[PDB]
């Protein structure tokens, strides 16, 4: 089998990503972000405490001829970015792009944290990465990815994500016409339960390229490119006027500047980021400094391939016995 589904920003700076997915009998469609930095696919549903809903479409379990209670079973989850939710658990069938899961553990949000509720345009989380992540307590369950990999022509998916547009998650299959080139595949590390790799460098415009080893991981659910301190500040120097600002809470620029490039390491191969990537608009309504879409990973203690990097490759995430990385231009 396999599975095709159009992602979509959900505002003009690609802020996040969301994928519709089919829950239950008859279907609900629920607009998900697709989380390859986390485990738990968990919706905003009937469920939920109600002065935390604001516009999201919810899954309601009693209104699912296939769903069940997982009895007993609770989850709780905490995001890098300080959001947070928790609740129960059902299981129901789940289907992306054609692709249908049954079985699959839906967790069933009780409570979510204000971000969630002010996000209007996200009905939950499909987490991607390893199910050893997984938060539902006291038997840990597996992501929809790990679910479905068996019966999957190709035990992958891909992440084609567009800047200021649309683009594809696809399951089980490699789109050919979809990237340039070749992919260059990479080592992965699951010992933390991300798609965790070493990029082999970096360079800034123009710039000559400076070999280093620099781990993180491809994490679809992080808006923008976390790396060290020294990477960053070799960034923004080249940007007239900006600086990191402790109030802001990060890298700002005049909004009248042209960003450079920054281009990554995979192996021996390199993937550009144009400069217009890096730009995350006013700070606020009005100002004219803007926010940097490359920031420092030095309060965070992991660097993070976020939207911002990925967005400018194919991305591969190989899930055979032993895990691989494939990055290609496109
Ligand atoms: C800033 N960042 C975001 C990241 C993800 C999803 C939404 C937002 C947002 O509204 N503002
Ligand atoms: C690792 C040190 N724990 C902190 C941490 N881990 C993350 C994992 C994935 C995505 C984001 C984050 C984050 O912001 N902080
Ligand atoms: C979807 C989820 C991410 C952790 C997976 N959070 C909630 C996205 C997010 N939303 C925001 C809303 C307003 C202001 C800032 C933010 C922000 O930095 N991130």
Redesign the pocket.
Known sequence: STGSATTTP??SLD??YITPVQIGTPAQTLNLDFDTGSSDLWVFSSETTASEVDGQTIYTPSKSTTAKLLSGATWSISYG?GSSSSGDVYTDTVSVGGLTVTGQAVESAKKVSSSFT??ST?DGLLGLAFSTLNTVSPTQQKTFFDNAKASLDSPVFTADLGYHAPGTYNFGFIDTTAYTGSITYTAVSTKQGFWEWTSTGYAVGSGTFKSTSIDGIADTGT?LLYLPATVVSAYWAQVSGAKSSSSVGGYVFPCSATLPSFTFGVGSARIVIPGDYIDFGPISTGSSSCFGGIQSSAGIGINIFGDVALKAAFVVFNGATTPTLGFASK
Do not use: K, L
Request: proline fraction near 0%; hydrophobic fraction near 35%; aromatic fraction near 0%.
């Open positions: 959900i505002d802020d996040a970015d002010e996000d996200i808006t």
